[PDB]
RNA sequence: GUCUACGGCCAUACCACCCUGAACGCGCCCGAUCUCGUCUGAUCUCGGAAGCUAAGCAGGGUCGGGCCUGGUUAGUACUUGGAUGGGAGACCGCCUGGGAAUACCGGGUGCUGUAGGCUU
RNA sequence: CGUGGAGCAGAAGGGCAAAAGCUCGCUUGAUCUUGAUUUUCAGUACGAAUACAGACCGUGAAAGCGGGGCCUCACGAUCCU
RNA sequence: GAUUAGAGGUCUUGGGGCCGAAACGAUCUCAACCUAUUCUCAAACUUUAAAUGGGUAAGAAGCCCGGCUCGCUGGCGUGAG
């Protein structure tokens, strides 16, 4: 019902989960963020200075500015049917890395190593990620018994 | 009548403080603001000059911040001074100063910064500034790391500071707490500071006991006689220690003896042992009760 | 009232049932099998709609089941205390009381 | 004042409590939920007779009172005065509004 | 055995709650000063109770704490009044006991009309070496679980040391 | 084996109680002239090193509570999608896919980076 | 004994336990000056807020923190004076 | 936060007591206050916690190399170009 309010409906969102109401563990401060690696935005509550707005709680986008102790972030805000590439500032206590890209980078390293090894052996293996194919034709050994007879349970009443 | 608070509910809703913050050895409010560097530089370490003084020893360390642990750049304790001739004096302000000097010159030598960047043996009221470059050393600044928060005018946590700076570390500090200043005088003379650095006050305490009560003197200063200490050398052995420290502040660590391999404590109990011990404790005493 | 801001105010107080709820449990001596349902069937005529009646497979208002309950009591894992019976697991620190007399 | 439970039968709203925000609710007509020899030990009455509701609806406290009395009179008639323990196991907490019209 | 566990004096807390505000407490503080020999301090009120004649911050009581040799000095000097006698209930749940006394002249000060008739309390806290471990700053824990004292374990010290006996009541 | 300083995870690390102690390692502990601050050298601070491991601390014990992790709870509750499926309604069955949480019964009870000792 | 059961100017929600509460000590960063961004949306302004930069400063040993209130409300165009 | 019920036990009071004197005394007791349980709840409660949901990535704007510039950051380095 209500309209504009900088934090509406964030009673549970910014809430420092269900036991960790303590001070900020320092590793989140001590992590190294650089220009152009994919962070993601999850707002804390204890910081009290520099929160992303609740529209950006969960979205994730590139990082392009690095201040003393707060980074700028480019994220895609949904609005009426256009999609905006908006830029914000966030104190570094609300951001964290996102394994989404890091896993891709690891599999890039294995792809390139495999390509080099194909150079060495002359054989063209299949490079990454053929999707999940249907099952193969296999023999199920039944030595041990004849299969169990399975039969419906008659009704009973447990109120 | 009686209401309890340590119940299943209260434990279920408990919240455990940090390890250090819980056993009471660290303040994180200080640490967070003290040992992180701005994200503009991303990896320029923020060296800390840890100082911590026990009831039997003084420890100066140079560390910094890493995602896993805290890399100790260097360490120097106050119980090793017999290498340099400081026998008695373990948590004296003079001992702290000498330990700080040891750490400073040790660090500069490890970096090859000892042929330059000498402080001074004698009194001072200041640090020593230098000029900074790339590729070759220009300076070395480590931010002080005191105790939890406690300091008043004249503490050895400042004594180690004075030792380090007189050894040649650029450290942000305006000296309004070293022994040698009083809040009402508002101007420090630093001659009293040299007196504390060389322990001349300790010498006066010795003399005060000497001409008051030999019994009380010995009962306060026993090991001093056993070392055969004189108040006369207590202002010069320190100086020659200040020479020896800058003569060679590099550590020469020791061997290790073979292991007796068997003891500190009580290896934990096996599962079957823990599962049949209750069986015995029930059944055996049970058959005894039924004997009765 | 005139709908210009209509919103009711408290009146009466009801309870919400669920398919499979238990609106009334009567406990008595087994001899009263045909008094229990005979009487209880009247409530079917005071409540709205239809409510199946039923005879429990349990000893009483206990969590438990058919009368192996009393065997378990003999084993002392169930302690008769109050309108219900108190459960006892084999956990707990009384590994000397269970010795002295279980 | 009739307002027969026809109107307020179906469950149709977010469950109100007697809350800090709804004040002055009329007290549920039914108040005491245990009748008969309710001090009995468990070993006495080995029979529990239930009653399950087969419709998703609302039951009115007034109705609960009438039902409990009607089911207690008969079973006093048959079993006696210390022969049972009738325990209503349902509680009216969901209040309902009434919009007075001019 | 060994001085490991020996009970020893921890503190003696003495105070006066004059229940007014003017010169009365000003003279009471003087009485405590003459007795102990060190300047005492004052406690105001926390709440307001018109029923007793106090308001928030009402400057009510004068108190002080004593440690070391003077503790036994004053303890015995007062206990001569009761000539070494207390009661069971006077030993609290942590072996620290109390008793109040009505006047001040049998504590060796002459009746001074410039002052009045003042009475003062006496609450003694016993202890062992190694209770201060729970008031430190460098690192802090408990006093342990079996390193403590209780009512009977303070009665032992009272009966042995000052010979005072205890009346069932 | 294990301790010391700084830590990262911040309960498999907490709490309770009993037992055990591989230096002077931490610490208790003895004093207050110097520095400092309190009503109290209790705290803080300083100077010490006679005894002490009684305590903290470390390790262990607990048919311990707690906590973490498994089962049973259950393919139940629940729901994306479908119908000219039933029911007067309240609700409900089915096709298709997803799929929980108590009660209850198991197991576990700190790991570890860094710089520094010792084998009492 | 004491896991926030209290206090944080006020509604409620969030947040806090060597603090963001309580007591002291010192002080005016409640100041001067461009641009950027968030907040409502036409992605106009006002309001409010975010993070940097250039000056003068404050406190603290210092690391740092501070450009109003612990965060979410507490306020205003052309013309004219 | 609301709420039924029994129990097991001392305590703070009360009904009338008694003792004979106050006794909540042994008898009580009735409540209260605990301690284990017990029946039913929450749009403005919550330890748990789905289905359908919202973001990002799934390679040349990439990866590996080599050398300069930087009035910035400063052990030596960093990062940025």
Phi/psi for B188 (5° steps) reads -95, 145
Q: What is the dihedral of CA B76, B80, B86, B90, to 10 degrees?
A: 80
| Closest residue on chain A to C54 (Cα) | A159
Asked whether strand G has any atom less than 7 Å from the CB of A57, the reply is no
With H, G, I as helix, E, B as strand and everything else as coil, classify residue A44.
Answer: coil
Name the residue with tokens 């946590």: B157
Q: Which of B130, B122, B74, B125 is nearest to B243 (CA)?
A: B122
Instruction: Supply E48's token pair.
Output: 């307001």
D61/C contact by beta carbon, under 8 A: yes
Report the alpha-carbon angle D75-D77-D82, nearest 5: 65
Q: Which of B211, E87, B121, C55 is nearest to D52 (CA)?
A: C55
Q: Which of B59, B48, B78 is nearest to B172 (CA)?
A: B48
Asked whether strand G has any atom less than 7 Å from the CB of B116, the reply is no
With H, G, I as helix, E, B as strand and everything else as coil, classify residue D27.
Answer: coil
Please check whether residue B221 is in contact with residue B209, taking contact to mean a CB–CB distance below 8 angstroms.
yes
Instruction: Annotate E7-32 with three-state secondary structure.
Output: CEEEEEEEEEECCCCCHHHHHHHHHH
Q: What is the rounded distance in angstroms from the CA atom of residue A88 to the CA atom of residue A95?
A: 12
Nearest DNA or RNA nucleotide to A127 (CA to C1'): H59
CA distances from B132 to B40, B110, B112 (A): 20, 18, 15
Q: What is the rounded distance in angstroms from the CA atom of residue A42 to the CA atom of residue A58?
A: 5
Within 162-221 of chain B, which residues have Cβ less than 7 Å from strand G?
172-174, 176-177
* Residues paired with C55 in a beta bridge: D49
Q: What is the rounded distance in angstroms from the CA atom of residue E82 to the CA atom of residue E77?
A: 10
Q: Do chains D and B touch (3 or more CB pairs under 8 A)?
A: no
* Residues paired with E86 in a beta bridge: E166
| Contact residues, chain B, for A33 at CB < 8 Å | 39, 42
Please check whether residue D87 is in contact with residue D67, taking contact to mean a CB–CB distance below 8 angstroms.
no
| Contact residues, chain D, for C56 at CB < 8 Å | 47-50
Q: What is the rounded distance in angstroms from the CA atom of residue C38 to the CA atom of residue C35?
A: 5
Instruction: Supply B99's token pair.
Output: 């330990």
| Contact residues, chain A, for B65 at CB < 8 Å | 30
Please check whether residue D45 is in contact with residue C27, taking contact to mean a CB–CB distance below 8 angstroms.
yes
How do beta strands D84-88 and C24-28 pair?
A: antiparallel
CB contact under 8 A, C32 and D84: yes
Asked whether strand F has any atom less than 7 Å from the CB of D27, the reply is no
Distance of C1' in F98 from CA in B62, Å: 56
Nearest DNA or RNA nucleotide to A79 (CA to C1'): G43
Q: What is the rounded distance in angstroms from the CA atom of residue B121 to the CA atom of residue B128?
A: 13
Q: Which of D94, D79, D98 is nearest to D19 (CA)?
A: D94
What are the DSSP calls for B215-245, one per residue?
Answer: HHHHHHSHHHHHHT--TTGGGTHHHHHHHHH
Nearest DNA or RNA nucleotide to A27 (CA to C1'): F8
DSSP C4: T
Name the residue with tokens 């256009």: A82
Using CB atoms within 10 A of its CB, is residue B212 exposed (0-12), middle (13-18) or buried (19+)? exposed
Count other Cβ atoms within 10 Å, centred on residue D29: 15
Q: Which of B25, B146, B171, B46 is nearest to A29 (CA)?
A: B46
Instruction: Supply B109's token pair.
Output: 């030598």
B34/A contact by beta carbon, under 8 A: no
| Stated resolution in angstroms | 3.6
How do beta strands D34-36 and B48-53 pair?
A: unpaired
* Residues paired with C78 in a beta bridge: C87
Q: What is the dihedral of CA B145, B151, B152, B155, to 10 degrees?
A: -60
Torsion B215-B219-B220-B226 (CA) sign: positive
Contacts of D61 (CB under 8 A, 6+ apart): C12, C13, C14, C15, D28, D29, D30, D92
What residue ranges in C1-102 does DSSP mark as E strands?
9-16, 24-28, 53-55, 78-80, 85-87
Instruction: Supply B85's token pair.
Output: 């001739």
What are the DSSP calls for chain E, one per residue?
Answer: --TTS--EEEEEEEEEE-SS-SHHHHHHHHHHHHHHSS--EEE--SS-BTTTTB-TT---EEEEEE-SHHHHHHHHHHHTTTTSEEEGGGB-TTSEEEEEES-SGGGT----TTS----EEEEEEEE-TT-GGGS-SSS-----SSS---HHHHHHHHHHHS--EEE--
Count other Cβ atoms within 10 Å, centred on residue A140: 4
Structure determined by? cryo-EM
Phi/psi for E43 (5° steps) reads -115, 125
Residue at the smallest CA–C1' distance to nucleotide H55: A59
Asked whether strand F has any atom less than 7 Å from the CB of B256, the reply is yes
Q: Which of B235, B231, B238, B236 is nearest to B207 (CA)?
A: B231
* Residues paired with B178 in a beta bridge: none
Contacts of E71 (CB under 8 A, 6+ apart): E9, E11, E12, E124
Distance of C1' in H10 from CA in E88, Å: 21
Instruction: Annotate B59-116 with three-state secondary structure.
Output: EEEEECCCCCCCCEEEEEEHHHHHHCCCCCCCCCHHHHHHHHHHHHHHHHHHCCCCCC
CA distances from C64 to C25, C57, D44, D83 (A): 15, 9, 16, 22
Contacts of B239 (CB under 8 A, 6+ apart): B121, B198
| Contact residues, chain C, for A159 at CB < 8 Å | 20, 22, 54, 56
Torsion C87-C89-C95-C98 (CA) sign: positive
């Amino acid at each position: 019902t209500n309209t504009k309010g900088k934090r509406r409906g964030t009673r549970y969102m910014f809430s420092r989960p269900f036991r960790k109401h303590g001070v900020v563990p320092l590793a989140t401060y001590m992590r190294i963020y650089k220009k152009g690696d994919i962070v993601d935005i999850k707002g804390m509550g204890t910081v009290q200075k520099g929160m992303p707005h609740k529209c950006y709680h969960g979205k994730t986008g590139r990082v392009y500015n690095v201040t003393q102790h707060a980074v700028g972030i480019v994220v895609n805000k949904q609005v009426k049917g256009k999609i905006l590439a908006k830029r914000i500032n966030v104190r570094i206590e609300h951001i964290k890395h996102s394994k989404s890209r890091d896993s891709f980078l690891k599999r890039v390293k294995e792809n390139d190593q495999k390509k080099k090894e194909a150079k060495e052996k002359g054989t063209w293996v299949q490079l990454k990620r053929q999707p999940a194919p249907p099952r193969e034709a296999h023999f199920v050994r039944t030595n041990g018994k004849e299969p169990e007879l399975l039969e419906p349970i008659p009704y009973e009443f447990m109120a | 009548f009686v209401k309890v608070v340590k119940n299943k509910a209260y434990f279920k809703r408990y919240q455990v403080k940090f390890r250090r913050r819980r056993e009471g050895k660290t303040d994180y409010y200080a640490r967070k603001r003290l040992v992180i560097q701005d994200k503009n530089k991303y990896n320029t370490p923020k060296y800390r000059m840890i100082v911590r003084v026990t009831n039997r020893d003084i420890i100066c360390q140079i560390a910094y911040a890493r995602i896993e642990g805290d890399m100790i750049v260097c360490a120097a304790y106050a119980h090793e001074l017999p290498k340099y001739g400081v026998k008695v004096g373990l948590t004296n302000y003079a001992a702290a100063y000498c330990t700080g000097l040891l750490l400073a010159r040790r660090l500069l030598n490890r970096f090859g910064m000892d042929k330059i960047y000498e402080g001074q043996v004698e009194v001072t009221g200041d640090e020593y500034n230098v000029e900074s470059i790339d590729g070759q050393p220009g300076a070395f600044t480590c931010y002080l790391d005191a105790g939890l928060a406690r300091t008043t005018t004249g503490n050895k946590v400042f004594g180690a500071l004075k030792g380090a700076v007189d050894g040649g570390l650029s450290i942000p500090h305006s000296t309004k707490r070293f022994p040698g200043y009083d809040s009402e005088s508002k101007e420090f003379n630093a001659e009293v500071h040299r007196k504390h650095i060389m322990g001349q006050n300790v010498a006066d305490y010795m003399r005060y006991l000497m001409e008051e009560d030999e019994d009380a003197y010995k009962k306060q200063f026993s090991q001093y006689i056993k070392n055969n200490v004189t108040p006369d050398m207590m202002e010069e052995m320190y100086k020659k220690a200040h020479a020896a420290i800058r003569e060679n502040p590099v550590y020469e660590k020791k061997p290790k003896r073979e292991v007796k391999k068997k003891r500190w404590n009580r290896p934990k109990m096996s599962l079957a042992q823990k599962k049949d011990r209750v069986a015995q404790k029930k059944a055996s005493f049970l058959r005894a009760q039924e004997r009765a | 009232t005139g709908m210009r801001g209509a919103f009711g105010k408290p009146q009466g107080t009801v309870a919400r049932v669920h398919i499979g709820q238990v609106i009334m449990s009567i406990r008595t001596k087994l001899q009263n099998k045909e008094h229990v349902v005979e009487a209880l069937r009247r409530a079917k005529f005071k409540f709205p709609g239809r409510q199946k009646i039923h005879i429990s497979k349990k000893w009483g208002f206990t969590k438990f089941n058919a009368d192996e309950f009393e065997d378990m009591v003999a084993e002392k894992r169930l302690i008769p205390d109050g309108c219900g019976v108190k459960y006892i697991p084999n956990r707990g620190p009384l590994d000397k009381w269970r010795a002295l007399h279980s | 004042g009739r307002r027969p439970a026809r109107c307020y039968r179906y469950c149709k709203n977010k469950p109100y409590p007697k809350s800090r925000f709804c004040r002055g609710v009329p007290d549920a007509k039914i108040r005491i939920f245990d009748l008969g020899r309710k001090k009995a030990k468990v070993d006495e009455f080995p029979l529990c007779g239930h009653m399950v509701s087969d419709e998703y609806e609302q039951l009115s406290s007034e109705a609960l009172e009438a039902a409990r009395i009607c089911a207690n009179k008969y079973m006093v008639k048959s079993c006696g005065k210390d022969g049972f323990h009738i325990r209503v196991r349902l509680h009216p907490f969901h209040v309902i509004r009434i919009n007075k019209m001019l | 055995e060994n001085p490991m566990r020996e009970l020893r004096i921890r503190k003696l807390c003495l105070n006066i709650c004059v229940g007014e505000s003017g010169d009365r407490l000003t003279r009471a503080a003087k009485v405590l000063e003459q007795l102990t020999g060190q300047t005492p301090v004052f406690s105001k009120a926390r709440y307001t109770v018109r029923s007793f004649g106090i308001r928030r911050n009402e400057k009510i009581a004068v108190h002080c704490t004593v440690r070391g040799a003077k503790a036994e000095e004053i303890l015995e000097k007062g206990l001569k009044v009761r000539e070494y006698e207390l009661r069971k209930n006077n030993f609290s749940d942590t072996g620290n006991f109390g008793f109040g006394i009505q006047e001040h002249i049998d504590l060796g000060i002459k009746y001074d009309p410039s002052i009045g008739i003042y009475g003062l309390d006496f609450y003694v806290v016993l202890g062992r070496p190694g209770f201060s471990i729970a008031d430190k700053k460098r690192r802090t824990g408990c006093i342990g679980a079996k390193h403590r004292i209780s009512k009977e374990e303070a009665m032992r010290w009272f009966q042995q040391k000052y010979d005072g006996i205890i009346l069932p009541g």
